[PDB]
Amino acid sequence: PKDYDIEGPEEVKKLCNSTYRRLGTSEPPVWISETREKMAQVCLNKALLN
Amino acid sequence: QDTMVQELALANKQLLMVRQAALHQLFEKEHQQYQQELNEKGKAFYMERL
Amino acid sequence: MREIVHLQAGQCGNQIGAKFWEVISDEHGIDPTGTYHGDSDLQLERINVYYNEATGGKYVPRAVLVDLEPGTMDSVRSGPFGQIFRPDNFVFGQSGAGNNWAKGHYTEGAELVDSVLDVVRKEAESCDCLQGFQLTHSLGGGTGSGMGTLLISKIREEYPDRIMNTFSVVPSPKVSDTVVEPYNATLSVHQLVENTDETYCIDNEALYDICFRTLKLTTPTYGDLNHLVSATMSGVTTCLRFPGQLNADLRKLAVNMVPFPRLHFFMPGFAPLTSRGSQQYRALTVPELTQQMFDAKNMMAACDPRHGRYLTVAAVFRGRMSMKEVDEQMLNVQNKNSSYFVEWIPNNVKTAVCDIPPRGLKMSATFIGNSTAIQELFKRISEQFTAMFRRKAFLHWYTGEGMDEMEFTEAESNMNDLVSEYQQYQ
Amino acid sequence: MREIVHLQAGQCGNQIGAKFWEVISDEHGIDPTGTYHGDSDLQLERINVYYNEATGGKYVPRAVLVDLEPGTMDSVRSGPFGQIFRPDNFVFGQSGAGNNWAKGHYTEGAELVDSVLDVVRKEAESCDCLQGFQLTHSLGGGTGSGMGTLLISKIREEYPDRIMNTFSVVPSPKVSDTVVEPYNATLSVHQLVENTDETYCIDNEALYDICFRTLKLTTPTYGDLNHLVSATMSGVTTCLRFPGQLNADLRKLAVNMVPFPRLHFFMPGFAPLTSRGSQQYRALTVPELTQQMFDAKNMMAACDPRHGRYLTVAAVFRGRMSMKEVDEQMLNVQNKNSSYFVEWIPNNVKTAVCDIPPRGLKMSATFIGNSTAIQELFKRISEQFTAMFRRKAFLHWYTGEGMDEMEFTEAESNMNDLVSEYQQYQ
Amino acid sequence: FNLYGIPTPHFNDGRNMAKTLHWLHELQMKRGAKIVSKRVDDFKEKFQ
Amino acid sequence: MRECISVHVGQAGVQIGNACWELYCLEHGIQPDGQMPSDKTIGGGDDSFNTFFSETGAGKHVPRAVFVDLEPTVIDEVRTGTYRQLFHPEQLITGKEDAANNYARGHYTIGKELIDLVLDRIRKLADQCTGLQGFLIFHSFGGGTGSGFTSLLMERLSVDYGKKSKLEFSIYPAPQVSTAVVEPYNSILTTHTTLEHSDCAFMVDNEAIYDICRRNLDIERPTYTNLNRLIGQIVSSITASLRFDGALNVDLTEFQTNLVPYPRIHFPLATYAPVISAEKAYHEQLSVAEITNACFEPANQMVKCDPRHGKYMACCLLYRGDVVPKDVNAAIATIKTKRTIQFVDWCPTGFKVGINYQPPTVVPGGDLAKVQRAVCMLSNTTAIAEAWARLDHKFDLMYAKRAFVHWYVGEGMEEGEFSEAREDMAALEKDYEEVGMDSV
Amino acid sequence: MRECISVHVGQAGVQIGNACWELYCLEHGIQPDGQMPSDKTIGGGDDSFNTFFSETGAGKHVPRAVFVDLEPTVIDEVRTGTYRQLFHPEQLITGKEDAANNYARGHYTIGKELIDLVLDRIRKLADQCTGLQGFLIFHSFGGGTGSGFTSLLMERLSVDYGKKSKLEFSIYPAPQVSTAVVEPYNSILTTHTTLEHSDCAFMVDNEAIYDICRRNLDIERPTYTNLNRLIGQIVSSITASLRFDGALNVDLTEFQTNLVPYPRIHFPLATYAPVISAEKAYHEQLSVAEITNACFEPANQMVKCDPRHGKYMACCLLYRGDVVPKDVNAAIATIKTKRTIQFVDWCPTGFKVGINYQPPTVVPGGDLAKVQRAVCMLSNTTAIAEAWARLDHKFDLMYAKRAFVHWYVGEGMEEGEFSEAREDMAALEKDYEEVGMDSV
Ligand SMILES: Nc1nc2c(ncn2[C@@H]2O[C@H](COP(=O)(O)OP(=O)(O)OP(=O)(O)O)[C@@H](O)[C@H]2O)c(=O)[nH]1
Numbered sequence A: 001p002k003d004y005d006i007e008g009p010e011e012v013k014k015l016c017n018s019t020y021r022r023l024g025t026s027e028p029p030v031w032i033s034e035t036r037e038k039m040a041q042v043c044l045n046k047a048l049l050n
Numbered sequence B: 001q002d003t004m005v006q007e008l009a010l011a012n013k014q015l016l017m018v019r020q021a022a023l024h025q026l027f028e029k030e031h032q033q034y035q036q037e038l039n040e041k042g043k044a045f046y047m048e049r050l
Numbered sequence C, D: 001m002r003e004i005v006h007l008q009a010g011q012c013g014n015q016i017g018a019k020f021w022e023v024i025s026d027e028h029g030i031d032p033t034g035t036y037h038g039d040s041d042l043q044l045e046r047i048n049v050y051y052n053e054a055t056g057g058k059y060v061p062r063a064v065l066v067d068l069e070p071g072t073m074d075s076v077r078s079g080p081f082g083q084i085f086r087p088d089n090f091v092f093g094q095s096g097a098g099n100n101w102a103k104g105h106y107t108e109g110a111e112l113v114d115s116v117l118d119v120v121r122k123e124a125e126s127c128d129c130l131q132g133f134q135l136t137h138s139l140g141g142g143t144g145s146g147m148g149t150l151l152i153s154k155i156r157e158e159y160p161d162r163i164m165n166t167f168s169v170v171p172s173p174k175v176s177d178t179v180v181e182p183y184n185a186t187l188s189v190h191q192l193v194e195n196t197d198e199t200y201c202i203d204n205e206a207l208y209d210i211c212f213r214t215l216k217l218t219t220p221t222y223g224d225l226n227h228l229v230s231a232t233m234s235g236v237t238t239c240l241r242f243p244g245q246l247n248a249d250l251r252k253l254a255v256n257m258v259p260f261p262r263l264h265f266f267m268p269g270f271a272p273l274t275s276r277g278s279q280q281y282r283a284l285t286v287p288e289l290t291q292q293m294f295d296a297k298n299m300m301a302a303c304d305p306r307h308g309r310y311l312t313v314a315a316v317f318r319g320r321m322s323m324k325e326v327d328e329q330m331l332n333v334q335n336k337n338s339s340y341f342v343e344w345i346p347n348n349v350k351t352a353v354c355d356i357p358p359r360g361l362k363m364s365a366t367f368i369g370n371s372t373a374i375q376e377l378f379k380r381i382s383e384q385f386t387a388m389f390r391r392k393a394f395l396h397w398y399t400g401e402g403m404d405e406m407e408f409t410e411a412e413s414n415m416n417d418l419v420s421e422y423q424q425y426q
Numbered sequence E: 001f002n003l004y005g006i007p008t009p010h011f012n013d014g015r016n017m018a019k020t021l022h023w024l025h026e027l028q029m030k031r032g033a034k035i036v037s038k039r040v041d042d043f044k045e046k047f048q
Numbered sequence F, G: 001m002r003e004c005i006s007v008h009v010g011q012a013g014v015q016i017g018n019a020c021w022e023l024y025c026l027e028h029g030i031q032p033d034g035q036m037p038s039d040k041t042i043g044g045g046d047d048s049f050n051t052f053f054s055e056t057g058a059g060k061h062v063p064r065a066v067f068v069d070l071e072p073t074v075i076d077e078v079r080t081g082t083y084r085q086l087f088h089p090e091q092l093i094t095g096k097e098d099a100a101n102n103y104a105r106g107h108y109t110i111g112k113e114l115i116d117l118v119l120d121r122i123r124k125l126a127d128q129c130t131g132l133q134g135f136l137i138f139h140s141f142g143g144g145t146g147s148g149f150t151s152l153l154m155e156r157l158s159v160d161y162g163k164k165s166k167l168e169f170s171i172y173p174a175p176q177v178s179t180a181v182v183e184p185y186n187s188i189l190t191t192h193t194t195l196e197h198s199d200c201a202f203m204v205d206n207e208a209i210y211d212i213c214r215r216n217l218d219i220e221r222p223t224y225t226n227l228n229r230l231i232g233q234i235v236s237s238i239t240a241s242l243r244f245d246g247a248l249n250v251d252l253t254e255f256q257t258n259l260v261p262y263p264r265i266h267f268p269l270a271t272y273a274p275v276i277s278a279e280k281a282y283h284e285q286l287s288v289a290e291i292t293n294a295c296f297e298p299a300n301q302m303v304k305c306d307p308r309h310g311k312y313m314a315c316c317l318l319y320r321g322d323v324v325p326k327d328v329n330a331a332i333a334t335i336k337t338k339r340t341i342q343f344v345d346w347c348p349t350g351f352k353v354g355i356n357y358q359p360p361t362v363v364p365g366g367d368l369a370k371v372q373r374a375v376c377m378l379s380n381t382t383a384i385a386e387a388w389a390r391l392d393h394k395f396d397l398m399y400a401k402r403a404f405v406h407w408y409v410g411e412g413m414e415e416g417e418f419s420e421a422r423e424d425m426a427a428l429e430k431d432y433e434e435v436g437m438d439s440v
């Protein structure tokens, strides 16, 4: 699964370009520090004869 | 106020012990005339080893 | 704020530097035009370290584009992210480097250091607080070893308190694509012993083997080869850019590493390399991360840590991790493997933790390490030089340019002094 | 006061021990969340015996669950009543024991001893006056027989004045559920007789013949004969925790029943046994009830009472009942079958009466016996041992991880020592 | 694809035994109360 | 927890994996991609997968297997087949040139070139696993990597690991058919280095599986796909107690301690009783009292002998589904009374039972009807010596005049192992007849 | 007004403070914004927030803290996080460059250019108070700031607030785990300068709290914000009498008089007590006795050092919640009978009790449960020597090679300091020896 290919059917083969935009595909959905996610948790959330 | 969460609890105890005693009379008095009414139609309750 | 300045010389440093801002513009969220298109406010806050500001939200990269032939300039601007580069930062001569240290440092070098220093002085005065400079080049070339080494000398004298980075592509042992590599690299390291605070020696086939056995593709390109190099120099300035729970900058990454002024030549390394068929088959975690981090088949310069032993190491970390396993799996490489560390330094690892992984990954780490194993990167380049300088091989191309033959004698006079201080702890 | 601590060893002890905890959290009134929801205050009259008060009105039941795998506890911790327990008592190993002594009592047994005896200890002096220890295991499989028998040796050393109750599951006569049982049976009983005060020799097949004949259930599973043992097991100790006009703790049953320290071999029983279709066809009164208390088909050991003269008998009763019907009726039993008792004891039978029946009942009772026919249980095991020990059939896994051959001979010599000490008392 | 072989109703947790160890004479008293004739009531207050 | 990895070496070993792993995929809702079926994907709900599967965090369940074989043609059709997305692409390793039915090539010549890859791969399975309970080595006895490689493969596993259990459910050379002529040579040699190391086998042939397919099932013209499926049904039943909690659990450690009488007798059966077509079980009511009788019946079992004289001496029965312990017990107490299924008198226990709460599963595209209950039986018998010395007698005909030996000694093999096999082989047949009738 | 200005210096101090201040904004209902959810409680009491939160015109309950660092990266979170409108704009101060794990920058360069501003803000805060019981400090005996700027402050403060409890709370270098190779130096350096400028130093180590958060709260992989919660519960149980009330009440001036024995041995190791996840707690008895016994255990101790290798010289058991004076007394009597716990001879007594009536507060999202009784025993054990010696061994292991000094002399610190401190710490170690020797 190559973003760019060097053996593909294209005409100009740029060797300076990489074949992969990223090192991996699985970036964390949201980007939040621990000092935020954690400290940002404070938010979150009888008788018969009275 | 901290006495009052303790005040209402003991007041619930007074009502509790005075309605159990009164309901005890009603249940025994009902059961006897339940037996009496059935005894006129030729039926009765089963007491174990009666 | 916390601005650092990036430099690069020659076509080797240009393809490094062009790919180095392929990945940071991807990281901060800069399009190939110049405008912001990210999804989080975290990657716009400390963007001052690499990207400046211009009217219209145009975040402009912060470099000085140095080369001696203009063909690489067309290679940079016609690239995918070459539009964002500021055009008068393209400083270029009209005569090539000659693949030569001599005319790259003495005659054609000296005609353009004034035009490079002027735009370096121009840029460095627009910031508030500057940490230091950062340069990528090749020791085997003519521009990076010739002019880039002169620029290291010039900006060190003008700014002595500022820290210095160089990312030198040291010549390769087995394959050689330049005959004058033992000449062009033994004089540039003569100035690297004193004019630089941090050096990251990088071999070329130490990128070829990792891109073959780990990234697992039989046909690599320079960009994939430069991708690994761009990862760690972005990984070194991680907490300098992004927040975290244990933050270390470039200077804090210097103090904890070198115990001596001259023993400052390092080994880079990037831990989470898999290949993309097995990204979904392998569970990525810290014990598997630090095992491949200290494994020397994943070393970014062609030296074997088995031959020597590490002096100190560092490993800054990315992503949302814990602290018990960046200690339990980090004492384990010391305690269970105790003969491969020097005994006169009790602890040996800097740990730094960030919250933000690079774009693409959840949890990453980069590795830098001082070692005695760098001695034989200099032994062989001595043996390549001693066997070749003795019979006066190519000196007429060097002594005819404006430096005497005796300047070559001092080249191995302190390269062997680097060794004697490397060999003393072996 | 008179509290006893429970111990469950192996998988077999982990269901019949667990099924006791639904039975007795039925009887004391404890709901499966852990709190109290009952009707009578006599239920929380002596809750200190089997449970310890934790925090805010819940009664966590005190029990040390020991096993070599967590998966048998996966059916216990995630049972209906798995979250009444405390998770700290869930002590377990990592790998398998596999019915071996030298793997379940020597190699992998001894590793988990320190982690079981500390939580047995630290739970023992948390109370004021310890009455005894209450095991629950089998003799067939060495995962629980191996650990449970060792746990006897290390408890009896530092608790010599406490009563030992073991709920052993002896092998069935006809067919086995494990081929290596006669090794596991003699190696259990060899020091189970010398270190315990009460063992109950229940087999599975007599529990089956109960469920086929005097209960008329065609397919009751393992969750049904467990309730037959567990509800009987509560009535053994019903005078510890429920008031009665003649109380009898576990210990005055111990002093009364066994005459000689070689005889800790008891047989239980339960008095209201009949089918759903045979309920109105029967009279629930003790002249019509003690018959089946002494009947052959309500014996849990598959031993013939005609073959076996009862040595000492304990009959503990529940509910509001007369005491002349306890005593005059029991000799009325003794008159017709005087030959099938012993006559050197003037009163073979011990009586005890409680005042609280279980739920759904108006009057109930349960049985504890000690008969001549428990010998035939032990000769059959010796017959299945010597035929298997003559050619050293499965001996090479016992010798394989650290057990001597002579311990088999010492156990077999002690095995027939029990047979010879028992026939002379006849 | 059908249920093949004999279905034997079983209850692995074991509520079948708890039903038959409940003595179905107070199951009726949990679900009510018996009504017998008067002359088994009056007879039995004399000779039992 | 309670995990155990598998190793599929040889063509027979890897093609059982091409049919057994279908069964596990249909058990725990694992689609061929390797995930929960897109939908019906809760946050997390079991640990039952763990015996033969492992998370990657995201939700893909990589199996715990090692595919090694010197022929890559048998490896490519799972690399390009339906299950290209299930297996990790690097654990599944091949060679260049096949061992070609030589024990010399599988242990001396080309076996050596791939020992480093498998043992490096097996140890990362062991490092990833937290508590390992056994080894599932799937290996035939005929070829050069089915027999020659597994002799060197488990030799290294028995010195680097030690006390871990070994399991086999594969194919033994048939007594009357064969697909190779050097099968009496390869099977006579791979037994030499797999006595004190292996603790299980499959002594019966594969034409008994032809007999069960043709005559129990209503199928004509059966094929290796159907044979591999029926063997995979038994591996799921022996490991059914490691994923699914039953009435009494029987995990992998006491398959060891119960089914081997002596350390050189480690040969249990493999008999799945209800091999019944959909067309017969609509017609027939299957009870657990008869499924054990049918398992012992010479019809339904694949015991290649006449079970009139099948002298069973260490039995193990495993049940799945709608079973109760008494109709296990009533059938198993009836069978000891019942005479002509002759048992050992000096082992009065003989049997052990295992009951699971999961009903037996079925794979689409098969002939088996989903039965409410099934039983698997592995009994160690001494009737194997009839089928054991005969394979030795199969070796003696070529033993005298040294046929096919020049391919061994010509390419890395000493002639002494051809002899040293024989006396250890005669000593093993001496061991089987020694336990016959000394107690009368 | 029993006020207490808190100074949190160093990346640790700030992180630790953020957490600590969440507990305070919860004990007293101070919405993470500044306003108190209109209510009257045991926290809304004008005499229950004053101890820390300063009142305003529109209930802007400001903190009396002063978070300090040199690298904006950390305090920018406390400035763009949940609690952004609380910490008054300039109560949180930052610089531009860090200290690069080096005491020199923290004391003779990057520090100097800031102390002025910081001291000025403390003068302002002090002015607002009416009884600054003490200036609680929180640093890091390892980084350049918590070792350097912290030192500079303690010194300058001494000649500005003078005799005023300067209680400390630092992350003393851990035994095996470590984040730097330039800590051996910084640590042995800071102590030498702060020794005669600090009153008490409730020390604590990262490794210890880690195990504590794995043996007890089974939070396997723990982050810093997890260990920073219990490193902040100690600060509440230490400063609880100056806020909520109770029977016996201890003050920020009592510790110095009841713990520190001689004017040099001021390093009381710390340990909390009911550390149980809200899942293993309920099912257990947490009574005064158990909690008290739990603290004097040779493991719950929050510093990787065993008391069984030393003598106790003063223990301060600070309880909290439904605690009964009687039970405490009996529990302390038992810990005196035990002979595995030994007290020095020159301390016949050695127990300082204190019973606040406010139960432990539950942070919204944490491993700790919602208990009712708690203890926090501070102990001046002579087992802090074994620690100081290992730090000393490290300093000498490298000072021999004059290593990692190039960037310590070239920042101001004359090479002399290294020896000055080294020799002084050697005196501390010899000092501890005599202090232990039982009287003759
Ligand atoms: N049940 C079943 N048996 C098979 C299957 N494929 C092969 N076999 C058996 O495996 C044997 C093949 O001979 P082997 O010695 O195992 O061949 P090999 O393992 O590939 O070794 P080499 O050919 O030398 O590489 C045959 O005799 C078959 O009986 C299959 O798909 N299902």
Ligand SMILES: Nc1nc2c(ncn2[C@@H]2O[C@H](COP(=O)(O)OP(=O)(O)OP(=O)(O)O)[C@@H](O)[C@H]2O)c(=O)[nH]1
Pocket: C245, C246, C247, C248, C252, G009, G010, G011, G012, G013, G015, G016, G069, G070, G071, G098, G099, G100, G101, G102, G140, G141, G142, G143, G144, G145, G146, G147, G171, G179, G205, G206, G224, G225, G227, G228
């Ligand atoms: N216990 C604990 N220590 C921490 C925490 N965060 C940082 N530290 C300490 O901080 C030290 C590393 O230095 P830094 O984190 O950079 O803090 P610093 O004092 O400002 O150091 P400099 O940035 O170089 O000035 C380590 O020795 C840790 O002990 C934390 O959350 N908990």
Ligand SMILES: Nc1nc2c(ncn2[C@@H]2O[C@H](COP(=O)(O)OP(=O)(O)O)[C@@H](O)[C@H]2O)c(=O)[nH]1
Pocket: C009, C010, C011, C012, C015, C016, C097, C099, C138, C140, C141, C142, C143, C144, C145, C169, C177, C178, C204, C222, C223, C225, C226, C229
């Ligand atoms: N790492 C890396 N090295 C490169 C790349 N392109 C060229 N080089 C190296 O640059 C060296 C030649 O240097 P040269 O072109 O003379 O450098 P210059 O004179 O400074 O322009 C060769 O040995 C190559 O290995 C690249 O994209 N990445």
Ligand SMILES: Nc1nc2c(ncn2[C@@H]2O[C@H](COP(=O)(O)OP(=O)(O)O)[C@@H](O)[C@H]2O)c(=O)[nH]1
Pocket: D009, D010, D011, D012, D015, D016, D099, D138, D140, D141, D142, D143, D144, D145, D169, D171, D177, D178, D204, D222, D223, D225, D226, F247, F248
């Ligand atoms: N009474 C009773 N016995 C059981 C039950 N489940 C299993 N068993 C016994 O467990 C024995 C098998 O041995 P095993 O379970 O391996 O014992 P372990 O090795 O100690 O765990 C058989 O003899 C059964 O009698 C049950 O629910 N009730």
Ligand SMILES: [Mg+2]
Pocket: F011, F071, F098, F143
């Ligand atoms: Mg083949």
Ligand SMILES: [Mg+2]
Pocket: G010, G011, G069, G070, G071, G098, G099, G143, G145
């Ligand atoms: Mg800092």
